[PDB]
Amino acid sequence: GSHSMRYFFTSVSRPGRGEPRFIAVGYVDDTQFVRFDSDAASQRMEPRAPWIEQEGPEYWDGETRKVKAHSQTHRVDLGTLRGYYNQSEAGSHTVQRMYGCDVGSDWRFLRGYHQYAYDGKDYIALKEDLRSWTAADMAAQTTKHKWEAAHVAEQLRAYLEGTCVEWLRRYLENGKETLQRTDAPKTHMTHHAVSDHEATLRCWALSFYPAEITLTWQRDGEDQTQDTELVETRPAGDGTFQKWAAVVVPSGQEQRYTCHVQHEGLPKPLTLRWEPG
Amino acid sequence: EVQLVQSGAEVKKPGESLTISCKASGYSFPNYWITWVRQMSGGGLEWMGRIDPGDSYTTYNPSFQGHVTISIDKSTNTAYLHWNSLKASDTAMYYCARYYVSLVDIWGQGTLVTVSSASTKGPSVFPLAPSSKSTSGGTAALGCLVKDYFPEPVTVSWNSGALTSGVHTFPAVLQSSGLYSLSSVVTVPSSSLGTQTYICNVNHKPSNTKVDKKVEPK
Amino acid sequence: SVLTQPASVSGSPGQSITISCTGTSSDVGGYNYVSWYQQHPGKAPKLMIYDVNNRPSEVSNRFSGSKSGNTASLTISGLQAEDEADYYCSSYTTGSRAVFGGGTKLTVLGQPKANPTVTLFPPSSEELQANKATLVCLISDFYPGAVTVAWKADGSPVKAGVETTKPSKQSNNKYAASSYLSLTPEQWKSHRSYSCQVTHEGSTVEKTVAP
């Protein structure tokens, strides 16, 4: 998908310590723009991107009401699920919910999704057609029949194919300078001798957006995947991302190795080499 | 500030069709359904159903399912409530309301509909003679019985309007026949029954009826 | 119906009253989404309290809300005559729906008690000449406005052809109501004495008429 809007909900029961934790975040592609934290002081949906701050009072009252409705629904879900699995309210349990939509290059609906997990495991999920459910076990079959009787899928579909896409389009325009930008990776290479015979070549990619990127090492033009160390793409803390890849090369054979960077901001892939000196 | 503005009151007969409307002035973010509620005379608030203005998805109460149809026109923000055939049980006040996320936050002013099968009929006026055992040295009660008329209202004056003190015209009662009936009572000094004449004047405009009934002692 | 409210409550001006609203663990005890609405006669409901104890800025701070378990409460302090109306509660249920209470009639006692004045008229001879017979029982000048009328023929209760109005405000803000026992000229002459029994604040007043 070209662009996406996603909402993430986490609910964590706290035995002996009061109300359950509830944390909700909304993303436009790889950019968080709203948050809600049950332990936060404001008890309102808060902005985390500059373009959503231009929204007026009714927007924020509406989002606050919707996220509090999700918060209170999750509070009931924790008890219901414990009832399904016969659990004695003495342990901490986790509920996670994720829904949203993707749009194509023409900003029109491509796919929608609604996922629900209990204790880090799939519980019930809306199928790609947005019409039926995939239930993971016998407890999810109870949820499925209830949601089928209440026509939950038909009403989630209207949001996922409709409202979700419409407000994604609005966000992409109002926040075009953040959301529609491409920051090509700033790339450099470092050299770290591990002995008199071997050395590590580390290929860097920094300050890039979006997070999707590919780093591959080649030797004589052949892929060296089974010998490349890759850290997962990590956030820099300022809206950009980082990544590096390293290979251990024999001292004297560094010129045989090349690092290739692929990114949306690069029209053609970049080739990096290590120049002794 | 958004307000729901409903259509005017409806006076209907059984078997006729009806459509009452509810236009939401101003704009609101798409966080709400439009709900229709029935409130019969002296009764609670009955949830009939609701509709999503975005996709016209409609939920009905199982008690109203099939008897009424809810529709919406998102281009005009107008919600509709349609009866295919009025049944005279549907005589009640009907409200539209906005359900915003987790709360009914605004109400329409209400559309009263009245489904009566009765035909226009002038009343028959009977005298309510003062009790022959009236309080000597006190006051006595006489009046007029305005019986079996339709529709509302009726006008009752006494002595061509020249008598106002002591007059008490009671609100009408709606019988199971569909017709109305009321009574007007004047409290007069008992010492006037022998000399003063009391004429009640019943005027029923929707049938061109004017009756003058004399109430005499015994 | 889905939520349970007392059918009526009363209070004196300047005092405080509380209206309860009982539900189940799925609506009232499951969520903090209890709402309260004020409805004057002939008018639309108006939002007074939302989200259990929240209040719009335009609503007087004499109204407050609370909840405990499966029962919510509306409290009105410093009762004024304008607070006399019907009150309905509502709660959130899942699926983003709402269930309502039955409604509570609030009476603010602004006048002393007034016993009703009952005058009972027999069917007129003009009406008996038309094969009809209507007994007119008229009630006036009582407060508060709540009466129940029972008809009796020679002591046995009569519930047939009985039409009774509800109490209605007079010009002096006392209440009035009427009840009509429709009969046949044969039934009017077949009994010794009919009776109109009006009950107001426990006390029962009686008026009897005979052919």
Partner: peptide, 9 residues
Amino acid sequence: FMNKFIYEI
């Protein structure tokens, strides 16, 4: 923009 509709598990 969140969904205004949500149902219990």
